[PDB]
Design a protein around this ligand. Structure first.
Ligand SMILES: CCCCCCCCCCCCCCCCCC(=O)OC[C@H](CO[C@@H]1O[C@H](CO[C@H]2O[C@H](CO)[C@H](O)[C@H](O)[C@H]2O)[C@H](O)[C@H](O)[C@H]1O)OC(=O)CCCCCCCCCCCCCCCCC
Ligand code: CLA
Ligand code: CLA
Ligand code: CLA
Ligand code: CLA
Ligand code: CLA
Ligand code: CLA
Ligand SMILES: CCCCCCCCCCCCCCCCCC(=O)OC[C@H](CO[C@@H]1O[C@H](CO)[C@H](O)[C@H](O)[C@H]1O)OC(=O)CCCCCCCCCCCCCCCCC
Ligand SMILES: CC1=C(/C=C/C(C)=C/C=C/C(C)=C/C=C/C=C(C)/C=C/C=C(C)/C=C/C2=C(C)CCCC2(C)C)C(C)(C)CCC1
Ligand SMILES: CC1=C(/C=C/C(C)=C/C=C/C(C)=C/C=C/C=C(C)/C=C/C=C(C)/C=C/C2=C(C)CCCC2(C)C)C(C)(C)CCC1
Ligand SMILES: CC1=C(\C=C/C(C)=C/C=C/C(C)=C/C=C/C=C(C)/C=C/C=C(C)/C=C/C2=C(C)CCCC2(C)C)C(C)(C)CCC1
Ligand code: OEC
Lengths: 137, 35, 82, 335, 340, 32, 447
């Protein structure tokens, strides 16, 4: 019962190719997740819009697919609506709006990848907990 | 006065004192365990 | 207002006491420390190590379900690398 | 007449009154009388009150289907919040009783009177040449009423969230409080029960020790109480025999031999403990809640290993999730 | 005779009085406190409650506990050498053997302790009203930690020895027994709360009605340890409360017995209520209320409100609080208000 | 019927309060 | 000099009631502790301070105090230069050494009494002239201090105005409200819902203006006391002793401690939500805003939306008819804030502005404040008691309010304690009832 590199193996892109994170990245991602996400996305939910969570399945049915490092990283730069037919960086933290969301100024591409990996790793560990809310607490 | 050393009070005192410090040392070590 | 025992105040003040207890008190401390740090404690009380609550995949709890064959059932729980 | 007003002041301040109406009494007596009269009438005959301001009246009076245990005086509407709502602020009494008008009239009058009651407990002590601080002990139960009836509503932003005036209603206040604040896991509360448990403990301690060490002056078939006369010179119990016993129960130096050091401790412990429990409610009135150890201890992989703290949280959710059914429209309870 | 010589030694006035009682008290009392402090730091509750309960696992002073045995155990005494543990010590800990250890030992320790009160009092030649009083704490421990679970399915539903583990015991009784609505419990708190009042009010009364027996302001030194005159004005105390409260004591012997009666009687009433909860004979509902609430959907009291809170507590807590039941409650079956 | 019973006992306690305060036994000093 | 034959050890400081010299040392050494904390804590805060991050998310209570005075901040509370924070911190910490020096000096070296080593500084508690005079001195010192604020605001830079026309920014106040009808009007305001008494101040003009009045009035009373003595009634009413004067100031601080608690909890102006957290109501108001904004974007007509109770999911009416936010947030319809006001009309929240004048900066403002409500645990876990560990946060508004209520209360206890003793000390029975002449025994039996 431990955090194996087997668990830290998450899909990198849409074309099946995967990437293996390290215990350093995970922790770093988890920390960065608290720094800039937890505020609204604590435990995989979304306080300011409970209809959309960070479940891998939910990210998969997103448009474009956001259930991989590449999907998530792009989002953190130019976030869109679930159908992708509208850019929402003005009311959502991102690199192209770091002037508006100062927390995103420090964040560099390493940080983005770490954060992305965290979102994909947690449900591997927590399971239904990561997606659901108080019901699973 | 010529007080003795080993007494019933001494026994009582140690039954609590000796394990305590042994526990305080053990717990103190627990503060460094992780994952 | 007095009994046979040697007044604490005198003993806690006596140099002889500290000559003794500067050795004894830290000794017990280091011993208790070793008791945990060497992982012995884990085995004396069957307490699970951070990597010994579940199996890798399993997410179920090793709940004891019958009194008489409990000990045997517990041992079986340790089998699945738990 | 030596001077009407001069006589008046002499009558008020008079220590020859059956009940000492003090200067604080001049405020207490009317206020306490208004509070009690309104309460009694309300508790019996008041119509249902829309406490949560959601047009969902809660009946808490006897004549409207309640008994002693369930009956209560329902807090003012959540539509009023912290607004001042006297009778002359309503188009009619019908409206006034619907929006929980009586409640404010009672709590304000009570808290006012109960404060002057503390003020009077000094005055009489002053008039009788005895030391003060008796009122200081009463400051503890008063500060709780204040925390429960005034401080928490102020903090939460509505008098509708103040503790109701009733048995079961008091139970609701607690259960919900536990949900929103996790009070059992708060140091100030824990100090409160400690003072309260310790209090009852020490009350039994002192009580027993003294009554057990009484000097014999009574017959075998005569009340042991008669062995005391009101206005004695000497003591009625052997405090030296008391100390001898209790000193052997534990050990000598862990026993009192000074009656004055004894009674101070008897007074200090519960008062201080309740003082913190009152500060607890007053602190959690600004949402500085108890310890949150939810999902603290986790295993090497990241799995959540539950504690009793987690089992507590499950009970708490149930309270949270079910309380005020139809009052919430949005995800977070920030009110 | 060796007996009277054995007696001689035991009843010798030491720093820590032993006595005949001590032969029972000290062994149990120590093992009970020791067993707790042991389990508190080392032994787990994983195989029994699916819980971490020790410092070794990461619990703190509040969340640590010596949890009850499994529900499988039933009311088994769980002897170290019993059919369950089979002499094994490690297994014994994991099956929650330390709970029945602490319980039974502590039980006899409370027996030994009251006996100590009885024995010492006899020697000192004082009345045993300290032993009579200590009966209330006995009744509570007996009713709660023994009688109650003896009425339930197993020791599992007894209060586990620990801070937080007791808090759940409170919430449980609320959710499941509606314990606050019980007349016997109410008498309980009235005694404790009323007892904590007597404690406060009497001490303060005394400290502020004292005579001047010294020239210093710190009047503590000015007390005569060798009886004589009353250190405080009972007569002044009387007239005070008679004018501020209307009623006042005037018989120290009654005042102090009253201080014994109130908190002892309360604890005893609360015991009886718990004895009734063992068979689940609770004070859960008011039939007249429910009948109207059923026919009339607009009838609402603070009583009805509370029951809904109970429904939530039961539903959301039962799964992880009663593992042995393998409870599975779908999200849709979970009772919930709006939004929350 | 229930309402009456509740108020009755209550009214009785208040009545007792009165007598307890103003019709007590006069607390006499020394020579008692 | 002083030992057990005066007071007990645990009442040690009461042995200094009549030792002017040493009693001055205490006050000078004590005042150093206050300056020391202020200094050492500011540097502690700065040392942890993260510029590109909200102050309320960093456990700051001193740097946001400096920020309000227009220092190191700019547009929208953006931190520009951390040097002023560093300065305020270090200067204090230095001054603590100077004060601490004198304190220690007067307490163990200098004259144990002052009366002889200087009749000007020496004093007598019962000397109604010296007391009113020393009081007169401090009444001026505080008066100038009140003007020190007025100066910083009108001349030396200004203050942080959240109500800034172009959006929260440091603004120089050059038009202080000096109209007495307006200023002292606040004192005649109710302390309940709506009419908020002193805490209801909502613009820097009044703040600066009011301080001008206080500054002058204080010094005016400062001079008055120098050149006078207490009247007749003033003497026949009060108790004149060292403890009595203490009690009077104790209840005074208690009252101010309670007023400060409500100020940091309710007021938006002198406690900017940009530096501190959002106020309690502000946070609950934001959630209604947020989800009114969301659902409306989903095509919902918020104006006519009917909630479970049939009251109005998003918008409803106040008891006086004003259009307000719906839900449990109906209790906070008294909230006013820069982000929300442009949506308000003459009858409350305007359905047309709500329908198409919602600005993006407002949406994310609502989301921010919504997700930063002053809800948390003692171990600092942001959210409801049932929340999960992740977000380590507790609103500064929560820390300050709770801390200062505890202090204010205990000071009310201290007041009663020292006021009760002074009355008994004066009349002379604070040490017990006279065994011989027992007062009660001379009064008729009420029986
Ligand atoms: C024994 C122990 C006894 C202990 C006694 C403790 C007493 C503590 C009470 C504190 C004194 C209150 C004085 C004060 O600070 O009074 C002010 C406070 C708070 O008033 C608030 O004032 C607020 C001011 O609005 C501010 O906040 C709004 C949003 O919050 C907007 O932001 C707006 O811009 C801004 O101005 C609002 O008006 C609130 O509705 C309103 O409650 O008064 C309150 O409620 C107090 C409620 C009235 C009772 C006080 C009676 C005192 C006798
Ligand atoms: C006098 C003090 C005292 C008392 C009353 C108890 C009481 C108890 N202990 Mg205990 N204990 C003590 C001191 C004491 N302990 C000390 C000092 C230690 C440290 C070594 C322990 C260590 C300890 C452990 C490790 C355990 C207990 C347990 C128990 C419980 C069950 C034991 C049992 O079955 O008794 C048996 C009773 C007797 C043996 C009394 C027999 C007396 C008769 C007169 C003698 C006859 C013998 C003769 C051969 C019979 C012939 C008959 C013929 C037909 C064969 C019981 C509540 C168990 C427990 O709590 O389970 C949950 C447990 O596992 N104790
Ligand atoms: C302006 C504030 C002020 C001032 C100048 C005084 C001054 C005085 N008080 Mg006093 N008092 C105050 C506020 C104040 N008080 C308040 C607010 C209360 C309410 C609690 C009291 C309650 C009080 C009592 C009950 C008594 C005094 C007494 C006295 C006199 C002797 C001083 C003494 O006993 O020191 C001795 C100081 C101590 C023993 C220190 C106590 C430590 C406190 C209780 C703990 C604080 C907790 C701390 C924050 C936690 C730190 C963590 C720790 C691990 C480091 C002296 C004239 C005594 C006297 O003679 O009356 C005239 C006396 O009996 N006061
Ligand atoms: C704000 C805290 C404070 C302050 C300023 C004082 C101040 C004072 N107390 Mg005091 N006291 C306090 C808290 C405080 N107390 C508390 C909490 C208690 C309860 C435990 C007491 C109990 C108490 C008793 C029982 C007595 C005093 C007395 C005194 C006075 C004489 C001090 C003395 O005997 O020197 C002795 C000095 C020393 C033994 C050396 C101490 C070292 C110095 C003072 C500290 C150095 C500070 C710093 C590290 C150096 C900086 C140097 C730098 C500037 C260069 C003095 C005015 C006495 C009195 O009445 O005066 C006649 C007295 O009898 N106090
Ligand atoms: C009273 C004003 C006050 C306020 C509002 C704050 C507020 C804050 N401080 Mg702070 N602080 C203060 C005074 C204050 N402090 C003082 C006087 C000191 C000097 C010791 C410090 C030293 C300090 C440090 C070193 C740090 C803070 C930090 C913080 C922040 C995090 C709070 C936290 O986690 O504390 C939680 C604290 C507790 C839960 C302890 C509560 C203790 C209570 C009051 C004890 C009560 C028991 C009672 C007195 C017993 C007596 C009874 C007996 C007589 C019978 C917060 C903004 C931290 C920070 O900025 O990081 C973000 C940080 O690292 N503060
Ligand atoms: C609460 C403040 C305070 C008060 C009332 C006193 C009072 C006193 N001190 Mg003293 N002192 C203090 C703080 C204080 N000190 C501090 C902080 C220190 C550390 C540096 C000292 C160090 C000190 C020493 C070393 C000595 C005294 C002495 C004395 C006594 C003789 C008067 C004197 O020296 O003034 C003479 C000086 C003046 C009258 C003029 C001083 C004016 C200064 C330079 C300007 C101050 C500006 C001020 C901060 C702003 C106010 C202006 C504002 C209204 C606009 C007198 C009782 C002496 C003593 O014990 O003799 C009995 C002595 O030898 N003090
Ligand atoms: C904090 C600073 C301070 C202090 C401690 C004092 C202290 C004193 N002043 Mg004073 N004064 C001050 C500042 C201060 N002054 C200032 C700044 C001015 C200029 C305006 C004056 C002008 C002044 C005059 C003209 C007189 C005094 C007098 C007095 C003495 C008697 C006060 C009295 O009996 O009031 C007791 C008050 C009452 C009996 C009235 C109670 C009714 C109050 C005001 C309303 C209820 C309060 C309520 C709870 C608070 C709510 C707020 C309200 C706005 C709603 C006393 C020594 C008198 C004296 O003896 O002259 C030397 C006197 O005639 N003062
Ligand atoms: C069953 C009881 C088992 C007792 C087991 C032995 C306990 C040993 C205790 C030693 C302490 C003692 O002797 O008194 C230590 C001192 C007494 O000081 C005594 O002075 C005497 C002078 O002749 C002798 O020197 C004694 O040896 C000396 O102990 O303290 C006392 O005055 C009061 C202590 C009361 C403690 C009660 C428990 C409260 C503990 C506080 C913890 C909260 C923080
Ligand atoms: C089980 C068992 C047993 C037993 C054993 C024992 C008996 C042990 C003991 C043990 C012990 C005997 C331990 C102890 C411990 C203790 C501790 C661990 C403590 C701690 C403490 C602390 C931590 C403190 C704290 C505090 C307080 C509380 C006060 C205030 C302040 C302070 C903080 C200081 C036997 C073998 C017989 C058999 C088998 C079973
Ligand atoms: C507007 C404003 C302002 C201002 C304010 C002011 C101006 C205030 C004032 C205030 C005041 C001006 C107050 C006063 C107070 C008073 C008092 C508090 C008093 C008290 C008194 C007493 C307490 C007394 C008592 C008594 C009696 C009555 C009888 C006889 C005896 C005795 C003495 C006990 C500010 C700045 C904030 C800001 C802006 C806004
Ligand atoms: C009387 C008395 C007392 C009290 C005392 C006191 C209260 C004292 C105070 C003292 C004080 C009040 C002190 C102060 C100090 C301060 C200082 C000494 C300062 C320092 C500074 C510096 C050193 C600088 C600089 C810096 C910076 C700028 C940054 C970097 C870091 C540093 C920090 C280096 C007692 C209770 C004990 C006992 C009895 C007697
Ligand atoms: Mn009555 Ca305190 Mn759960 Mn928001 Mn309403």
């Amino acid at each position: 019962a431990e955090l194996t590199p087997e668990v830290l193996t998450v899909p990198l892109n849409s074309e099946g190719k995967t990437i293996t994170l390290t215990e350093k990245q995970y922790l770093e991602g988890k920390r960065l997740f608290q720094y800039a996400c937890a505020s609204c996305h604590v435990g995989g939910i979304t306080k300011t819009n409970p209809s959309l969570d960070l479940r891998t399945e939910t990210l998969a049915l997103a448009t474009p697919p956001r259930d991989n490092i590449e999907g998530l990283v792009d989002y953190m730069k130019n976030p869109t609506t679930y159908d992708g037919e509208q850019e929402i960086a003005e009311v959502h933290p991102s690199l192209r709006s770091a002037d508006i969301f100062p927390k995103m100024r420090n964040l560099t591409e390493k940080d983005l990848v770490a954060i992305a990996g965290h979102i994909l790793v947690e449900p591997k560990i927590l399971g239904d907990k990561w997606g659901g809310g108080k019901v699973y607490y | 006065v010529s007080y003795p050393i080993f007494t019933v009070r001494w026994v009582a005192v140690h039954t609590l004192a000796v394990p305590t410090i042994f526990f305080l040392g053990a717990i103190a070590a627990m503060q460094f365990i992780q994952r | 207002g007095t009994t046979g025992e040697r007044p604490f105040s005198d003993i806690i003040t006596s140099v002889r006491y500290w000559v003794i207890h500067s050795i004894t008190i830290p000794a017990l401390f280091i011993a208790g420390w070793l008791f945990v740090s060497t992982g012995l404690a884990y085995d004396v009380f069957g307490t699970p190590r951070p990597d010994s609550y579940y199996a890798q995949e399993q997410r179920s709890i090793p709940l004891v379900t019958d009194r008489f064959e409990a000990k045997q059932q517990v041992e079986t729980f340790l089998e699945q690398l738990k | 007449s030596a001077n009407l007003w001069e006589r008046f002041c002499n009558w008020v301040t008079s220590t020859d009154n059956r009940l000492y109406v003090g200067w604080f009494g001049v405020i207490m007596i009317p206020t306490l009388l208004a509070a009690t009269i309104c309460f009694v009438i309300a508790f019996i005959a008041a119509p249902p009150v829309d406490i949560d301001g959601i047009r969902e009246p809660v009946s808490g009076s006897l004549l409207y289907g309640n008994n002693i245990i369930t009956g209560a005086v329902v807090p003012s509407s959540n539509a009023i919040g912290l607004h001042f709502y006297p009778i002359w602020e309503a188009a009619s009494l019908d409206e006034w009783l619907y929006n929980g008008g009586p409640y404010q009239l009672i709590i304000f009058h009570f808290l006012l009177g109960a404060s002057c009651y503390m003020g009077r407990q000094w005055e009489l002590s002053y008039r009788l040449g005895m030391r003060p601080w008796i009122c200081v002990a009463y400051s503890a139960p008063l500060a709780s009423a204040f925390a429960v009836f005034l401080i928490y509503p102020i903090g939460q932003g509505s008098f509708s969230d103040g503790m109701p005036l009733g048995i079961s209603g008091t139970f609701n206040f607690m259960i919900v409080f536990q949900a929103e604040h996790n009070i059992l896991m708060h140091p100030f509360h824990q100090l409160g029960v400690a003072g309260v448990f310790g209090g009852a403990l020490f009350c039994a301690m002192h009580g027993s020790l003294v009554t057990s060490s009484l000097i014999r002056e009574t017959t075998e078939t005569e009340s042991a109480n008669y062995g005391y006369k009101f206005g004695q010179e000497e003591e009625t119990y052997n405090i030296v025999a008391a100390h001898g016993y209790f000193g052997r129960l534990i050990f000598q130096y862990a026993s009192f031999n000074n009656s004055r050091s004894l009674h101070f401790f008897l007074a200090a412990w519960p008062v201080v403990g309740v003082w913190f429990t009152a500060l607890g409610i007053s602190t959690m009135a600004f949402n500085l809640n108890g310890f949150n150890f939810n999902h603290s201890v986790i295993d090497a992989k990241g799995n959540v290993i539950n504690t009793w703290a987690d089992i507590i949280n499950r009970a708490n959710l149930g309270m949270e999730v079910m309380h005020e059914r139809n009052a919430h429209n949005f995800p977070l309870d920030l009110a | 005779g060796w007996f009277d010589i054995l007696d001689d030694w035991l009843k010798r006035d030491r720093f820590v009085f032993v006595g005949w009682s001590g032969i029972l008290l000290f062994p149990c009392a120590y093992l009970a406190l020791g067993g707790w402090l042991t389990g508190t730091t080392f032994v787990t509750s994983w195989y029994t409650h699916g819980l971490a309960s020790s410092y070794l696992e990461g619990c703190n002073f509040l969340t640590v506990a010596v949890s009850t045995p499994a529900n499988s155990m039933g009311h088994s005494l769980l002897l170290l050498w019993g059919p369950e543990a089979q002499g094994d010590f490690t297994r014994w800990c994991q099956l929650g053997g330390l709970w029945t250890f602490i319980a039974l030992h502590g039980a006899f320790g409370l027996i030994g302790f009251m006996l100590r009160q009885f024995e010492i009092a006899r020697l000192v030649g004082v009345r045993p009203y300290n032993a009579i009083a200590f009966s209330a704490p006995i009744a509570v421990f007996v009713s709660v930690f023994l009688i109650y679970p003896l009425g339930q399915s197993s020791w599992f539903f007894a209060p586990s020895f620990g801070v937080a583990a007791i808090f759940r015991f409170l919430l449980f009784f609320q959710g499941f027994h509606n314990w606050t609505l019980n007349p016997f419990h109410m008498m309980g708190v009235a005694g404790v709360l009323g007892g904590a009042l007597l404690c406060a009010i009497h001490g303060a009364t005394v400290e502020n009605t004292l005579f001047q027996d010294g020239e210093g302001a710190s009047t503590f030194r000015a007390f005569n340890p060798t009886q004589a005159e009353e250190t405080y004005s009972m007569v002044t105390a009387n007239r005070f409360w008679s004018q501020i409260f209307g009623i006042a004591f005037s018989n120290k012997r009654w005042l102090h017995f009253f201080m014994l009666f109130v908190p002892v009687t309360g604890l005893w009433m609360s015991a009886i209520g718990v004895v009734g909860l063992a068979l689940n004979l609770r004070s859960y509902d008011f039939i007249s209320q429910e009948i109207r609430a059923a026919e009339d959907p607009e009838f609402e009291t603070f009583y009805t409100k509370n029951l809904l809170l109970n429904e939530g507590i039961r539903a959301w807590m039962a799964p992880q609080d009663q593992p042995h039941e393998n409870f599975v409650f779908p999200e849709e079956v979970l009772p919930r208000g709006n939004a929350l | 019927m229930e309402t009456i019973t509740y108020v009755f006992i209550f009214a009785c306690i208040i009545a007792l309060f009165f007598f307890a305060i103003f019709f007590r036994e006069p607390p006499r000093i020394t020579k008692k | 000099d002083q030992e057990s034959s005066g007071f007990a050890w645990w009442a040690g400081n009461a042995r200094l009631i009549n030792l002017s010299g040493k009693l001055l040392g205490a006050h000078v050494a004590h005042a150093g502790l206050i300056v020391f904390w202020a200094g050492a804590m500011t540097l502690f805060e700065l040392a942890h301070f993260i510029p590109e991050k909200p102050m309320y998310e960093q456990g700051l209570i001193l740097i946001p105090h400096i920020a309000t005075l227009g220092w190191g901040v700019g547009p929208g509370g953006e931190v520009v230069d951390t040097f002023p924070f560093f300065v305020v911190g270090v200067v204090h910490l230095i001054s603590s050494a100077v004060l601490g020096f004198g304190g220690v000096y007067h307490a163990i070296r200098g004259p144990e009494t002052l009366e002889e080593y200087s009749s000007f500084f020496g004093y007598d508690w019962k000397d109604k002239n010296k007391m009113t005079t020393i009081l007169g001195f401090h009444l001026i010192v505080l008066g100038i201090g009140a003007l020190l604020l007025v100066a910083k605001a009108m001349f030396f830079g200004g203050l942080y105005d959240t109500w800034a026309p172009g959006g929260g920014d440091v603004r120089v106040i050059t038009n202080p409200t000096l109209d007495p009808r307006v200023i002292f009007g606040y004192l005649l305001k109710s302390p309940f819902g709506g009419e908020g008494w002193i805490v209801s101040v909502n613009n820097l003009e009044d703040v600066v203006g009011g301080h001008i009045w206080i500054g002058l009035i204080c010094i005016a009373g400062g001079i008055w006391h120098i050149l006078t003595t207490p009247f007749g009634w003033a003497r026949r009413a009060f108790i004149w002793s060292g403890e009595a004067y203490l009690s009077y100031s104790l209840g005074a601080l208690s009252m101010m401690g309670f007023i400060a608690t409500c100020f940091v909890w309710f007021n938006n102006t002198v406690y900017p939500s940009e530096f501190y957290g959002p106020t309690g109501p502000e946070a609950s108001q934001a959630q209604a805003m947020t989800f009114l904004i969301r659902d409306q974007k989903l095509g919902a007509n918020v104006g006519s939306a009917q909630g479970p109770t049939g009251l109005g999911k998003y918008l409803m009416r106040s008891p006086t008819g004003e259009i307000i936010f719906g839900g449990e947030t109906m209790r906070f319809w008294d909230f006013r804030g820069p982000w929300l006001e442009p949506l308000r009309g003459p009858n409350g929240l305007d359905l047309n502005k709500i329908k198409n004048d919602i600005q993006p900066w407002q949406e994310r403002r609502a989301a921010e404040y919504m997700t930063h409500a002053p809800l948390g645990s003692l171990n600092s876990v942001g959210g409801v008691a049932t929340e999960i560990n992740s977000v380590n946060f507790v609103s500064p508004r929560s820390w300050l309010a709770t801390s200062h209520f505890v202090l204010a209360f205990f000071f009310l206890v201290g007041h009663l304690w020292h006021a009760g003793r002074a009355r008994a000390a004066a009349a002379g029975f604070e040490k017990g009832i006279d065994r011989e002449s027992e007062p009660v025994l001379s009064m008729p039996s009420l029986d």
